[PDB]
Nucleic acid binder design. Structure first.
Lengths: 76, 79
DNA sequence: GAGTAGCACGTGCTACTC
DNA sequence: GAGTAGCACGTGCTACTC
């Protein structure tokens, strides 16, 4: 039985390894780099915090321009 | 001896665990009692990053469109 | 040469799902 | 109970560094 248990755990580990590779490549600071699992988790965390901040800032800009425009359509 | 390598590894795994829990903190992950799997977390994080980038691209684009829309209203308002 | 870092494997538990 | 997924260990290997 151990031979088989060993083969399935190996498969399980391979899928996790592939998933680390895919997360690493979704991060614009590690893509195409030999990063350790620790570096992948830390940089992805950073990138996610960064991207959430950027998307919020842009959301604001989008509301600022919408208010500015709808108020011009009036003057027009 | 071995208790040196075995102890270093255990400490390496703990720090890696701390990085995983933190990432788990961010990312909606799941509603209610969450799951680890390590696999589900790595999967969800990737997809969430993907969503953040798609929203960025669409935000930058709408900003550009709103800006073109604004200059048109201004020039029009002239006449 | 000896120490360290990062991995990946074999293994034995828990906790299901069928 | 039989068949695993998920996980933590204890270890063995490889590649570096000085």
């Amino acid at each position: 039985k151990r031979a088989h248990h060993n083969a399935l755990e190996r498969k399980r580990r391979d899928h996790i390894k592939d998933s680390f590779h895919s997360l690493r490549d979704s991060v614009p600071s590690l893509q195409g780099e030999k990063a350790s699992r620790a570096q992948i988790l830390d940089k992805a965390t950073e990138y996610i915090q960064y991207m959430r901040r950027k998307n919020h800032t842009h959301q604001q800009d989008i509301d600022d321009l919408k208010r500015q425009n709808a108020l011009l359509e009036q003057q027009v | 001896s071995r208790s040196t390598h075995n102890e270093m590894e255990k400490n390496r795994r703990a720090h890696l665990r701390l990085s995983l829990e933190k990432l788990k903190g961010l990312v909606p992950l799941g509603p209610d009692s969450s799951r680890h799997t390590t696999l589900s977390l790595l999967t969800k994080a990737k997809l969430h990053i993907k969503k953040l980038e798609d929203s960025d691209r669409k935000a930058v684009h709408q900003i550009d469109q709103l800006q073109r829309e604004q200059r048109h209203l201004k020039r029009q308002l002239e006449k």
